[PDB]
Amino acid sequence: ETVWADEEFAGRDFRDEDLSRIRTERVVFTECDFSGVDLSESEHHGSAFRNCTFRRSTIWHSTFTNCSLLGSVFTECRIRPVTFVECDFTLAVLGGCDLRAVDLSDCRLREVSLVGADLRKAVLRRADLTGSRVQDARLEEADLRGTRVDPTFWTTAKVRGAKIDIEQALAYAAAHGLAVHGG
Amino acid sequence: ETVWADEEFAGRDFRDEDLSRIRTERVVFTECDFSGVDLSESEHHGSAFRNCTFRRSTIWHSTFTNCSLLGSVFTECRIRPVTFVECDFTLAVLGGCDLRAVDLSDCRLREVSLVGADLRKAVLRRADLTGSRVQDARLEEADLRGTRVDPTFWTTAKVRGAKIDIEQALAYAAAHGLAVH
Amino acid sequence: IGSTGERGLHHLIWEVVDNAVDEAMAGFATRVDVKIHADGSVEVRDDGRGIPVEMHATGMPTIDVVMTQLHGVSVVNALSTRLEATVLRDGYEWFQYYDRSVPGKLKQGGETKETGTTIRFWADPEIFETTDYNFETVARRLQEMAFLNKGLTIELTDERVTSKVKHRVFHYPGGLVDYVKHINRTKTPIQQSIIDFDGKGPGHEVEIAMQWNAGYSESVHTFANTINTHEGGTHEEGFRAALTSVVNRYAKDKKLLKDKDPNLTGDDIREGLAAVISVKVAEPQFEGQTKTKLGNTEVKSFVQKICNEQLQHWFEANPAEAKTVVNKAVSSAQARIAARKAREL
DSSP, X not given: OOEEESOEEESOBOTXXXXXXXXXXXXXXXXXXXXXXXXXXXXXXXXXEESOBOTTOBOTTOEEESOBOTTOBOTTOBOOSOEEESOBOTTOBXXXXXXXXXXXXXXXXXXXXXXXXXXXXXXXXTOBOTTOBOTTOBOTTOBOTTOBOOGGGGGTSBOTTOEEOHHHHHHHHHHTTOEEEOO | OOEEESOEEESOBOTTOOOTTOEEESOEEESOBOTTOBOTTOEEESOEEESOBOTTOBOTTOEEESOBOTTOBXXXXXXXXXXXXXXXXXXXXXXXXXXXXOBOTTOBOTTOBOTTOBOTTOBOTTOBOXXXXXXXXXXXXXXXXXXXXXXXXXXXXXXXXXXXXXXXXXXXXXXXXXXXO | OOOSSHHHHHHHHHHHHHHHXXXXXXXXXXXXXXXXXXXXXXXXXXXSSOSOOSBOSSSSBHHHHHHSSOOOTHHHHHTEEEEEEEEEETXXXXXXXXXXXXEOOOEEEEEOSOOEEEEEEEEOTTTOSOOOOOHHHHHHHHHHHHHHOTTOEEEEEEOOOOOOOEEEEEEOTTTHHHHXXXXXXXXXXXXXXXXXXXXXXTTEEEEEEEEEBSSSOOEEEEEETTEEOTTOBHHHHHHHHHHHHHHHHHHHHTTSSOTTSOOOOHHHHHTTEEEEXXXXXXXXXXXXXXXXXXXXXXXXXXXXXXXXXXXXXXXXXXXXXXXXHHHHHHHHHHHHHHHHHHHOO
């Protein structure tokens, strides 16, 4: 599969295309339309998908390593299972998405929409979820150890059975109005 | 000062007695009736009040030091202000009682009924509340540091603004189903 | 303190090794040797100046006052069934021992012009849950120390078979430059250069190395007197403010960013940044009970001042690389502004 490298695509409409099994290295997709597109078994190293739409697309069985997804929309995207290593989802829309058991360890999820998102059993270690919207989000049995979250996260997300660290347990109590004394 | 010492009273009805300002030392009261009785400014050292009733009594300004209140009923008792030092309240009934800002530090409160009890700003340091019933119990801004509680305590009692220790914060999370560490 | 698990056991090692690294930072030690012996003792040797040997004011030799009374290696002595110190100083070899911290009589050996210190301690198994040190942990910490002390070779030998040894040598003549090369190994630099500069103030010094990669993450590592300030602090805030200013000024000067456009944010400029910031502070001040955050007020403006001068210089001298880095931050800034406008509508 011919490797795409060091190319920019700007405002390009791909809805007409099969993009299954494509391999990109340092390719920048700016405001491109991937609605309904097959992107399955594709491979991306240092590529950027910024302010793109993945509405009703398939990216399952793909690998994204050190990629940007900044501002991209994943509404009704077939995502899982998938590999993301150290990807930036800043300001992306993942509302209602099925991300069950997906590993987003060390990923930036700053100001992401996860409204109604299913992250049951998701692995989120050392991820940054600051400013993210988690109204109705299902985090049951997720691994949250080391994950940076706003205090409201603890009164908003469904976290029954989630794994957390000592610092997070103290924030959980403070978020529910307990006054914790270290002394 | 009327002093009773090393005496046992069994099934005795005290309702028509003024017992204000009495002192007891090592007195055992078994199934005695103190309903409506004035016990104000009274003093008790090593005394035992077992399955006694204090329904609608007054114990204002009283001191109980190392006493048992085992199974005794305090419904509508005028309690605060009061001094309890190192007392055992096992199975006592304090449902609906006004215990706001009362100090029960280092007291055994095992299997106590605190159903609908008001303990706002109560001081409960190093106490044992194991097996206690705290449905509708108000613990807002209570001092709970070092207190032993069942996990259901954290999902049942109203504890907004309560003071707790690190270990209790871990138990609060576990009681809500978080897996800590 | 520490804890009484892997975190605390290892802190014994860090306390002895730190005293060696202090000699290095002072320009007197060049070599630190660390051995994990088959008996579970740890030996640390340095070619420093030696722990002082002569009679203190206390009414005991200065080494004894270093090993018994707290506020240092005292913590190690106190948590060890035995400690042994061999010191080369004042023209003689010396040997002193401690059994549960109780000193023996300082003994004078033979003459030598050599100077240095060797500390061997046996962690108390009645205190620590596990006395079973982790080779990979120790190696990762000593490598980090080597990156931060250019002129220093650090040798590690583990003699425990769970007779073959596990051996490593950590020597990085490039210092922070080698650290950045390590950080960027698995990434794609977008500039041939690694930026390296330093500044000297009264009661403080700073060294910075940095290089941009093609990626979308920030890998910036911060140190105050050799310690890893994991929660960051005033040296990192100093650096951040100076980098944001220099790149905005330059982007405007070279017209890579329009007059009327908003400033680039730190998120935009530090996308793909590999950087190390090492400060020295004569009187350090730490925040949080973690103690991993530098709070020293005057370090912010010191670091900011130095970075402003040295980054201006570098951007001015290196137009082709500067353009690549500013264009990367400009394209990032345009995606972040478009993402936010679309989320708020």
